[model samples]
Target: GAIIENMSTKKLCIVGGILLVFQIIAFLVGGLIAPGPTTAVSYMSVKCVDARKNHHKTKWFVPWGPNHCDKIRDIEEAIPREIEANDIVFSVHIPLPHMEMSPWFQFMLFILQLDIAFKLNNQIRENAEVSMDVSLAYRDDAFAEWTEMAHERVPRKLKCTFTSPKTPEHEGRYYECDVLPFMEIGSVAHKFYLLNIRLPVNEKKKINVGIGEIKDIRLVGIHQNGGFTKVWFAMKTFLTPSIFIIMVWYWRRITMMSRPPVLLEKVIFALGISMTFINIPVEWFSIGFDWTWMLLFGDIRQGIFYAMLLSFWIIFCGEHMMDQHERNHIAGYWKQVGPIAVGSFCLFIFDMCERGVQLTNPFYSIWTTDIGTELAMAFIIVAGICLCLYFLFLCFMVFQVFRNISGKQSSKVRRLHYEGLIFRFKFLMLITLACAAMTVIFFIVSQVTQVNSAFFTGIYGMWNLYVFALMFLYAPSHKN
Candidate 1:
């Protein structure tokens, strides 16, 4: 069934060992050499007062350097002293005061958190939603005038939960509020950004009421550095045509075979096609063309590729099952494969609901509302269940493969072929496991300043090399 059965063990050792070394190099490149993929920096606002009673202009206050405005630590401090909510304005700077913003940071995502101080008189009740009059502005140079980016008055659904002791005795203790997906700047070409937020109070309109005292607004900006982006682009540009040629080569070889294609062969080719489509970077076009639709398209491309890859793994597991039953058709594996389709389809539906609506309204968050959160959680649970099912299925198949080989080892002639198939299967599985484990571990570590370029490029290279190896070693040895 495989050309690996025909080749000498000595030749395989050489090639296999070489690939192993390359895999390790890929690991080191991300962990040691390449620059960090993303970075996060915090921005906490300074509360300023309109002492002059000029409420009409909505003054823009800067938090960094020489303090040009009066500052208050808490809203309750102002309110308990009989000061009104209209007199307060929260101003935040996007990055460190002294730090100069670089265009190399490709994109910026701001995660918004509010520090709400609990008080007996005014407590956060059920279905709390904060109404904010927020304005965002950017400037390239200090002396230059500020240009408006996006400013709107909107209502945001908040998830706030407090401790048991909510009495006046425990006043000023902050209530934990869930982080909000506040701002997403697709491209960060500007040097500096400033956001001014206001919560206007109106007794007649019942606005900005029931919302607990907001002590401070916190935003942590996350962006990809230029180093990673440049390397990422280069890797994609290089891999785009490389996998494409391999796909053509593979298909040509498949057609030349005496018999028609098997399910695994078709699945392999489909996986190759997905990798190629994803490898081709549409970001270049999006950079020049319109941005919104491009973002939506990119997500769709990624989702499709992942769905295909997941299916490929399942088919691969079935092909190398090593059991007595010889299964070659898609129908034979349809029962297990159904989960892949359903799982990915559910994920796509979830994206349509969230990113679909976000296309029109960038600030709209699906997780903020209670019903929205439940929907998001439900989709994730379904997707997770499918993934675990696949993993467990693969493990059980591998276990059975090993057990069957163990029982049949006494045979003299068939043992060579059996061992060869097992060898190749285990090799690929080993590499896949290593790469995936490192990716997950690195992802967790990156949050604590641990994750980079090779994290992506290396993994990308690993899979391409894997497909190439698969096609070469598994080609029919029909020495006509």
Candidate 2:
């Protein structure tokens, strides 16, 4: 009951127009909400906890923070400055806010971690062996005052602990927590703290104040990084709406063409809806909702997208086949793809069990020493590998089709019959492969550079944009 038709340039124009609207929206959001310039800074630390652990009665100076010198007495300054309490010691965080992506495997491989530095003041060093309390501070226009907290004693070693809350619905995203131990020598004038911070370009409003000395400073994290969250919010806000419009445009086009919108169109619409949900800038309200459940919602959206993509792939290949003979001639491996889909389903369930629950608590990690965690990880990893293998097989079949089409290019019957569909399929495959390869390269670089690098985040975005663009633009249509 289907009538063959011509590919409509109007539909293609509409799709391009939708994409352009999104691009404009993205630019506006970036211009408005992006943070201003930032620089190196530091923050408060454990005071009473420090001396109680050390029996040294003399105050311990944290030379590990800022270095005070005579030549730099009246250095010119430019930047919004803030005052701090004396009792609280502040050390600058490296890589600024880019540390949001920190993974231990990547952190361990960072080159900067090899070299170490310290901060000190003159008076503290003169009073050596005097086990006394120590406080932390940062120098400014000299007008800024620092009020010392109740407890300030020198301790031999400083222990810093950071706790991470659970992730939302994107279940397979597993991460770890760590305890950092460092030596604190309080004998110098300008106390210094060492942080081998590596930040990516485009990271804004970043600031860290813990441990001792501060090094690389930029507009990245919370302190200077205050505006970053706003940028992300705006970007997502625009992206979600733009994609929603495209979804509408696409559906309307299908209807206008007198085509009873096929399953592919319905699924594409669902995909756009899911992406909109996934990219909604709702983290601003996350604080009110405690940010717990929304994390799970995000994971659920990711799951939906993946499932839709898998279904889309299978259906695309299925519909293109003139007969079962073409499929069998291409590859018997197509038969196994069904099981692969089933396995991906099982993996999703496993991820829901492990990471899905962690979204509720800031203190949860998927790799806690339990056997259940190990089992879950194993299942997900296996399932992910299977998905990869299945996709490769699908690609192989597509390639086979292209090869046959190539040999028949001179034959008028074959060219007339399959040229349009074949060209479209080849274009889709090339784009998909390019996107996949770029994603893999970026992922490798992120893991190698401690994940917190802003460069990798940009890379991640670029990859996803390509993916969504290809899916939206080259999606198979019933008409040729």
**RMSD (Å) of each candidate, 1 decimal:** 5.1, 15.4
lDDT of 2 by residue, 1-480 (tens): 111223444555576467556555553543455423122233322121122232443233331224321111111121122222222222232232213221111101111111112323111122112122223233222233332322333222222221333233422222221222121211111212222211111214211222322221121222223344445555567566656666666656566665455544555566566666666666546433323454445445556555555655555555454435333221443464455445544545644543454333312344433465576557646655665676676677666666655655545754544675455556656756555445435423422333322332243244335436644563435543
Report RMSD for candidate 2.
15.4
Error of 1 at 97 (Å): 4.2
- Expressed as tens digits, the lDDT of each residue in 1-480 for candidate 1 is 446777778877888788768766755666564557777678778887777556565456777655456777565577566677677788887767667776556667778887888888777868667888888888888766668777787788777788659777888888877888786665555777888888987768877888887777887778876667666676678768877886777777678887887677777777787778888977666344435455556667766776776667667766766555557666787887777766654555656556677545556776666688797777666655655565666667657666666665555657677777667667777665554444334333432344434466567667667766777676665563
Model 2: residue 80 alpha-carbon error in angstroms: 45
Best by lDDT: 1
Model 1's TM-score against the true structure: 0.76
| Deviating ranges (above 4 Å) for candidate 2 | 1-228, 257-261, 287-291, 325-362, 370-384, 404-422, 437-449, 452-480
* TM of each candidate vs. truth: 0.76, 0.48
